[PDB]
Amino acid sequence: GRSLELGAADIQDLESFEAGRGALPARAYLQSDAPRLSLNGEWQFRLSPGSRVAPDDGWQLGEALNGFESLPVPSSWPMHGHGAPAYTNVQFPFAVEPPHVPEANPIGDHLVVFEAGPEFFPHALLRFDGIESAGTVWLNGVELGTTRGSRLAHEFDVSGILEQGENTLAVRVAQFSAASYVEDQDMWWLPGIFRDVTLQARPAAGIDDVFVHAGYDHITGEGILKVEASRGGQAIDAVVRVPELALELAAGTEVRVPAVEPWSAEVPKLYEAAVSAAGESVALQIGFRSIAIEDAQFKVNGRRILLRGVNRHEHHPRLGRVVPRDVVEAELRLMKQHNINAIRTSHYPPHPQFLALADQLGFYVVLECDLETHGFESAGWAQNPSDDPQWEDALVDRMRRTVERDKNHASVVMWSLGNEAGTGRNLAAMSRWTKDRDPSRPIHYEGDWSSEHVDVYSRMYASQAETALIGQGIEPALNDAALDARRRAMPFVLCEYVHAMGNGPGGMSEYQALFEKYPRLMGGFVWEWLEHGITVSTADGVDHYGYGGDFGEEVHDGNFVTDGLVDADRRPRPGLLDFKKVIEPLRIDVARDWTGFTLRNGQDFADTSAFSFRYEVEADGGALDGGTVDVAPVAPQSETVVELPGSVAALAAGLSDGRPAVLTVRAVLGADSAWADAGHEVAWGQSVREPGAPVPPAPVEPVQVQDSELTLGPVVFSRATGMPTSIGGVPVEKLGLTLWWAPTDNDLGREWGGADERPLATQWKDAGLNRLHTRLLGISANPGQDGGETLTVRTRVSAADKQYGVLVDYTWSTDGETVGLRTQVRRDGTWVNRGFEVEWARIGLEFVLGEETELVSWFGQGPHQSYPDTGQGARAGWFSLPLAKMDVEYVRPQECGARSGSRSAALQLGGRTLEICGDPFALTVRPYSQDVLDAAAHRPDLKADGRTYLYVDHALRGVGTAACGPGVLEQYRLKPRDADFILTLKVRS
Amino acid sequence: GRSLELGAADIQDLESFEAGRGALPARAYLQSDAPRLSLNGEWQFRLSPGSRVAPDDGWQLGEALNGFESLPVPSSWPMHGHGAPAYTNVQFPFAVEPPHVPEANPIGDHLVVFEAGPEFFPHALLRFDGIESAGTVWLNGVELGTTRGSRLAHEFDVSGILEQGENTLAVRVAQFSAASYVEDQDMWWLPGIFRDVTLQARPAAGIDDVFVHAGYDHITGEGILKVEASRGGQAIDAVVRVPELALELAAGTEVRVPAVEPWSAEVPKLYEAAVSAAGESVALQIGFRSIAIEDAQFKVNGRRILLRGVNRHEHHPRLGRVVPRDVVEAELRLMKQHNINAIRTSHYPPHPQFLALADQLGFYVVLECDLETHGFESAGWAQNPSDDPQWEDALVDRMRRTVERDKNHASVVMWSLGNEAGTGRNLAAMSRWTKDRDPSRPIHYEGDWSSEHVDVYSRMYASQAETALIGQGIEPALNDAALDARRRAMPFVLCEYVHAMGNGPGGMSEYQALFEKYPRLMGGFVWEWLEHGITVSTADGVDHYGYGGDFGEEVHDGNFVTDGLVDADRRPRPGLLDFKKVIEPLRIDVARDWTGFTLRNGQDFADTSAFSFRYEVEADGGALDGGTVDVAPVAPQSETVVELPGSVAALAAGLSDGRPAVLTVRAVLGADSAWADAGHEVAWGQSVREPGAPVPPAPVEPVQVQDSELTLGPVVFSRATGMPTSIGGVPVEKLGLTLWWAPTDNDLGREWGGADERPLATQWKDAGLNRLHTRLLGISANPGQDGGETLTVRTRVSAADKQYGVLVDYTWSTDGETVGLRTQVRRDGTWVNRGFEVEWARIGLEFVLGEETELVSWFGQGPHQSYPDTGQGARAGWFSLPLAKMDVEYVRPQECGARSGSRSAALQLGGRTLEICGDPFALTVRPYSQDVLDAAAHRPDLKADGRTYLYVDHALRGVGTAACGPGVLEQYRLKPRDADFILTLKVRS
Ligand SMILES: CC(C)S[C@@H]1O[C@H](CO)[C@H](O)[C@H](O)[C@H]1O
Ligand SMILES: CC(C)S[C@@H]1O[C@H](CO)[C@H](O)[C@H](O)[C@H]1O
Ligand SMILES: CC(C)S[C@@H]1O[C@H](CO)[C@H](O)[C@H](O)[C@H]1O
Ligand SMILES: CC(C)S[C@@H]1O[C@H](CO)[C@H](O)[C@H](O)[C@H]1O
Ligand code: NA
Ligand code: NA
Ligand code: NA
Ligand code: NA
Ligand code: NA
Ligand code: NA
Ligand code: NA
Ligand code: NA
């Protein structure tokens, strides 16, 4: 019975249910005057493909390193050519049999040589702030211990092992371990030592841990301060000095500061402080805030707050989980610049440096533990680590390290147990551990809807309808009356909503109106802040983002990792510009007569004093009037009516009919803040004098008949097809009805509920909307006016194998300068296919012009795209962009770039300019066809063909959020219908 | 109100509901002594893309031909580079709005100049035997008329238009017309003048039409003869001479021939005859047969017959609908050579020349009218031409021309109204017209299950179960008692069954047993005889077949056109070799003791006198005994027991135990027939003395342990994986469990019935069966025998994200020469995924050898492939083939080539030979992996990689016919289970 398998001991440790061994007690991450040496830099790295063939050849000693090579540390090592990134959403990339690991399991051996001066003696520790997923640590050949909890910190005492002068630190990192079963976040699998490695001296009579407690009495204005300090687990004597408040006190004792300025996301007041013992001093930033739940409302400092949140992953398109500090600071400023006031650290603690930046810049943080067992759901949660008693110690350790590290930061207003981990005994243990350790912060966890072990009711992607019922407290009761009573007394948060994947998210405004109406609604956190795109260079040297499957994954989830409000390089998607407007903290309703505007202060604490209120009147020629208006400060949750200067109203009263003019009132920062320069726009409102309807040209030019062509003023028609073949010299290669668009990511998600759950994209393909064909029925010229005639072209549009159709009639007219086009659309037969109604993407026309377009200008909404349930950030005005800037650089190309609400448009096709006017239409211009757009999986797949594809839509459907959560709301769907609409066209040179 | 559209008159004719105009009355195709001149050859051809731009430039006159070019006539013109073939199954390739045609509609102008001598004067006609789909005919500028009914003949009188000497014939052919709506057969859309164009003189006092009536009185042996002859529609005087029967009689009168030899498919007796008037004589072949329906049985000449049928389309891989006569004769001989006795002309009349060949070679023909409106089904049959009164005249014309052309041929035993045309008034009119015109043949039509207007109950792809209930007369009743009484008194035919697409068809034997058991079952016609592959040459110059979508179709149905028993070049698929055995007309059951065989004559008319009965005993060394045995003729439907020579039994009694020997009794043709040479095999039976079970080698060699390898006799194992890395010097690159195979066409069809209707291929992908992974659990060496040891390798196989698995244990043993491998498979967890049980394709092993294989030999079933529900044609014996001949050249590559029931196998890998033995296993060898097989859409996509992929299966599931009709029958499914099996391996040089 001889056992002959290799590497059984390494594998048995990888399969362990326990937390890491050998590490010091979890504590706060603290800024200390103690000596420190960062071991970051260039290490040596050897990759082996599994435990059984990973060499046990004394490499830890740093001598005779066969097969090592330079690798930066911190790193996610697939980002540097060792293996590849792999992306899964829910599915595990290995067989599900906890706690066992697959045979293919990348093992990365890391090694670094450093110098330890006398200041690291006699006592020092090594601190690892994150290793994915299983680390074993040797120092000078001696085993220190192991790490479990990939985004949690570990510290190992090196006293009596660290030698003066030169030392050799060695770390073996296994990508997969039993811990992988509890780290199934929807993101790239990325092994490595991806956070700081640090040597820290531990002088005697020092401070190991500190627990700040800084409450605020909103009735008295008092701060309630107690700073606890400990060493070796024991409360020690230390002095706490807070200069700004005239405070010297002893650690351990609670005092009442007579008057403090409270901390909030709006006003992040931070008092500098220091706690010190004989051998060590620790610098703190203290924010006085108290969190309370009463009347089913989540309150900070005595006021219900509104969360304007995003879910923040840590991703970098070239460095993986390594986010450089400048990228962190820049992205939180970007968040502030878009009215965001809350962050959820989905779904693991962030880099320890993040916390101070959130304290300073001002965000309400939901700090989330590193726990997700989502992959067990598909088996009915069988073997779920969250309910398996053998994982209890591991999971409690995760919560402990999570809480201890960040417990001092005012910005953390909730602890979260994890994400989509099911329900189970171990989550209850983590809750009980947290409530006892830190009763000052409510506990969040969406995964158990009964809310038995949490303090707030949390859901993800609940529909607008259900959110409205919850806001009113009338959602259906829980079976357990006692649990139901508790949950009904909780405030409600959407930890994830308006999935921001691709074109979208639609429906954001309907959520926001409910957040404002019902105090029990705490708000929501958009899923998610960034796309996880990974930069890839094609053979030519062209950059684009790759996603799941682009890196050879056997199982993957494609572009579901690119679902953000900004791309991986933090460039805004249109959804972010819309989101900023949706969550703007002030509401400005400009009066129709331009005499004033209503101003509501939607903030919770600040008044309007930080803002300058600016107005401008813009017409076709440019700005006609503008200035600033003084507003006596408006209190939070109050409103007033601000008179505008009489010149504005007078200008409006004197406008001729049909002359367009736009009045915009903007609230901008009066002075530089920590997160934007003075004049930065925070909120806005407008009132528009719309251009009158266009006048059809007089039908005075007649139809000139030839053998194979017909001419009506500037329009040449092919007599065979009845379609225009050129307009004013601009060649027209095709004109026809459109009812379809290249499916968005939302259109590829399943239409849940009811008997038909085919995605909308599939419903459309089945129906043939992408392959319409047109039969000509007749061409008549008819008596117009004083010798002129109109031309009517009758057609029927359908698709192969379908009996349903639309009759489309084009009536053309011209006076020689303007072309008038009336289009009439009539349903023919019932638009049902495979048993279910067909819905349309649009009702419009596609002009394929035989010239390229360089510039597109329009009067309408802009500058960015807008669909019926989006475009809140698009304002009324005059806009002009080069063609390439009309498009949107989504990683998977899809329908985008329509400008809804357009009244006029001008395309510069070289020397000539094509001017389109008419009743409100949506405008899109591209250098490639819808089939080239739909076929493209990445942006280099789009190819220009030298034509101009011009879309003029009389109707559009919304974009919704069906990739995850609600589809298009009822009022934005587009069922087949009859339609009619007028355009004017004119070509200029 | 001026109308300006182009080509409205051409289009209005294309949209016409009427049959062609201007043609002479439909008549029989008759062999006449009248002068004839075939206008086949090289014509001139111009293609325009639609009616509106097709030139009206006097081209019919043959002068100034701008844009014409040589094109053979007959032709399907896409086959010669003008446009492309397009394939749809059910869906129309144009919008469904009868009778309107699409704007893109290929218009082919045809022109030929010919010479008409004095023998074509004063009277001649032009005959067109098929134009797809709308022809307009001019002769010397004068319009003759138009053609509707693409596979029906038209004749135009050219008296006074044909000029002596030189004439110019011009034909405009439109691909699409209103007729397209009633010609929706599942096949290539192929416009052209695809059948003969002929000039025929019509001398005075001639014969226009002839209607032969040749009945058989099976009680008296009398023939019942009446030959009708007409001219200009009127019964004329003509003399009928049948030399062989001593007959001279007048046309028009019925006589009783005292004794005739009756015609049947088994014995196609044809009497030569001639009917003549003053100016013309017509040669006929007369077969005396009477068709009757009684006692719910379809009888010919007094006996119920059994139809052994195929559905025959007309297709040629380079000429489209043009089938050269030599290909026709060769393919019907091939049919006879495979025991086929019946043909259904799916779904249109064949070339007129086909009928005489079926009379002569001997087939029961279902002659089917050119009518199919299948594309209307998806709209609930709305606007179905079969029930639209405006199509009545068109549809009756189709039936009339169909019946008139072929009414004289004994082989036509049923008229068919068409195929999948729904139900409607117009089908009733076609039935009433046929029953009145020709009461001597029953009417067939599957589309109306109530059978109101037919004489036989026909169905397609009814399950074995339902066929069994119908055979017993206990199928559920129709709602109308009167209609139910009629249908229950009808015999039952499967006009289509055992869909022969790709690997398959399975389940054929279960149908055949029912056809034999129940007299009401008439038999069935396999769908279908040939694949419609179109030869295509890749850039390299490599040939393969293309199918739907390979020719740029916008809508298509892929490889559903390659669903035949033979490929387009008439090379048999394995399904044909199986089918021939299934329908063999004699049953030979060889006795277990080898003393004799039971012989049942399954024919309906012939005895066994045409057959020589041959026996042979084959052993490992070759033939041991053989000869012929005399059998007193057995009557139809009788049986006897034929003694074999005592030497055979004695040989069997003297065989040592475990020595394999096979006794085969064959019925071969004693003498050359019209369709095969003497000795051609018609039926066979076998009795097998199976080799005893293999003896595991003695476990006397021990396990030699090294650092990274283990050696057990000739086997080297990698110590890391526990898997063999070489066996006797043959490198082993991988060994593991298989549970999956590259989906067949059947596995891609939906599993109808129940809550899960995902295709089996999809069920497997969802379950991860194609991406199994293996974790190593342990490697133990254990005490064997006299110093030797066995090696056990314990593994678990699963897939990423799945909790279910199988434990697989390999126990190896060797005495130095033979390697013994015991494999044990144990289910771990419930194999359920997405709510439904997972089923396996197989339980086996995959050896990936690092050398190429040149030759594969085995003892088992062969020579061709066999799966649990197929392989009837594979007999027991010893077989040996070069590797490339183990594969099957299906147009879409898919699982094929397994040899089930194997007892031993030998692979020649260069110099060395790998010998596998064990209990019954299935054997497959390929030069490429299953993923290369599954990914390949065409055969050039398969790529060899220099390895050998060896599959040894302990269990396989059946292949069924789920691409159309029943899936795998219950007894051949493969639910997960525990299994264990032993192999021996041995390498030789
Ligand atoms: C073929 C181009 C005109 S498509 C063009 O490519 C660019 C990348 O260079 C951007 O991705 C644009 O969004 C895209 O429109
Ligand atoms: C199968 C999905 C509905 S689960 C859904 O996937 C999303 C993908 O972005 C998010 O990650 C959500 O957290 C998750 O609930
Ligand atoms: C890459 C080859 C070994 S696959 C090989 O190709 C042949 C065509 O040349 C045949 O189609 C065989 O069936 C196929 O196995
Ligand atoms: C949708 C199918 C089940 S219809 C099915 O298609 C087959 C394809 O070979 C055959 O042509 C049959 O005639 C037809 O009934
Ligand atoms: Na949502
Ligand atoms: Na995602
Ligand atoms: Na589009
Ligand atoms: Na655009
Ligand atoms: Na069948
Ligand atoms: Na088919
Ligand atoms: Na296969
Ligand atoms: Na094979």
Numbering used by the authors:
A (entry chain A), B (entry chain A): 22 to 1010
Which of the paper's sentences describe this entry?
Usage of native protein would limit us to analysis of substrate binding using substrate analogs which could not by hydrolyzed by the enzyme, such as isopropyl β-d-1-thiogalactopyranoside (IPTG), or less preferable substrates such as ortho-nitrophenyl-β-galactoside (ONPG). Determined crystal structures of ArthβDG complexes with specific ligands may be divided into three groups: complexes with substrates and their analogues (early complexes) ArthβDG_E441Q/LACs, ArthβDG/IPTG; the second group are intermediates complexes ArthβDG_E441Q/LACd ArthβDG/ONPG; and the third one is the complex with product ArthβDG/GAL. The early complexes with substrate show LAC and IPTG binding in shallow mode, intermediate complexes depicts deep binding of substrate that directly precedes formation of galactosyl-enzyme covalent bond, and the product complex allows description of the product release process. At the early stage of the reaction, the substrate is bound in the shallow binding site where the galactosyl group is stabilized by a number of H-bonds between its hydroxyl groups and residues N110, E441, E517, M481, H520, and H368 via water molecules and by an interaction with a sodium ion. On the other hand, the glucosyl moiety of lactose, or the non-galactose moieties of IPTG and ONPG, are hardly stabilized by any interactions during shallow binding.
ArthβDG is a five-domain protein of molecular weight 110 kDa. The catalytic domain, in form of TIM barrel, is surrounded by three IG-like domains and, as typical for the GH2 family, an N-terminal super β-sandwich domain. Regardless of low sequence identity, this monomer’s architecture is strikingly similar to KlyvβDG and EcolβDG, which enabled determination of catalytic residues E441 and E517. Cold-adapted ArthβDG possesses a functional dimer (not typical for the GH2 family).
